[PDB]
Amino acid sequence: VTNNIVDMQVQDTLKGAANMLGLYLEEQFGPLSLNVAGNLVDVDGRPIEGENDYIDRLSQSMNVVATVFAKNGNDYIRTLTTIKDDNGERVVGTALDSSGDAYRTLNAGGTYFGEATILGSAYMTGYVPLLDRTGQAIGACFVGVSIESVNAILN
Ligand code: NA
Burial environment of residue 114 by CB neighbours within 10 A (0 to 12, 13 to 18, 19 or more): middle
Query: How far away, in angstroms, is 102 Cα from ligand 1 center?
Result: 8
Residues with Cβ within 8 Å of residue 145, at least 6 apart in sequence: 10, 13, 14, 63, 64, 65, 123, 124
How far does the centroid of ligand 1 lie from the alpha carbon of residue 103, in Å?
9
Ligand 1 centroid to residue 1 C-alpha, Å: 31
Alpha-carbon span 72 to 30, nearest angstrom: 20
The rounded Å distance from CA 26 to ligand 1 centre is: 30
Ligand 1 centroid – CA 118 distance (Å): 9
Q: Quote the CA–CA distance of 51 and 139 in Å, as a whole number.
A: 16
Q: What angle do CA 80, 82, 86 make, to 5 degrees?
A: 120
In the reported structure, the alpha carbon of residue 127 is separated from the centroid of ligand 1 by a whole-number distance in angstroms of 14
Q: Ligand 1 centroid to 75 CA: how many Å?
A: 14
- Of all helices (H) and strands (E), which one includes residue 3? helix 2-29
Q: What are the residue ranges spanned by the domains of the chain?
A: 2-154
Greatest alpha-carbon span in the chain = 52
CA of 98 relative to ligand 1 center, distance in Å:
7
Cα 144 to Cα 21: distance, rounded to the nearest angstrom: 12
Q: Give the span between the Cα atoms of 129 and 87, in whole angstroms.
A: 29
**CATH of the domain spanning 2-154:** 3.30.450.20
Ligand 1: centre distance to CA 87 (Å): 24
DSSP assignments along 58-120, one per residue: HHHHHT-EEEEEEEETTEEEEEEE--B-TTS-B-TT-B--TTSHHHHHHHTT--EEEEEEETT
Evaluate whether 17 touches 30 at the Cβ level (below 8 Å): no
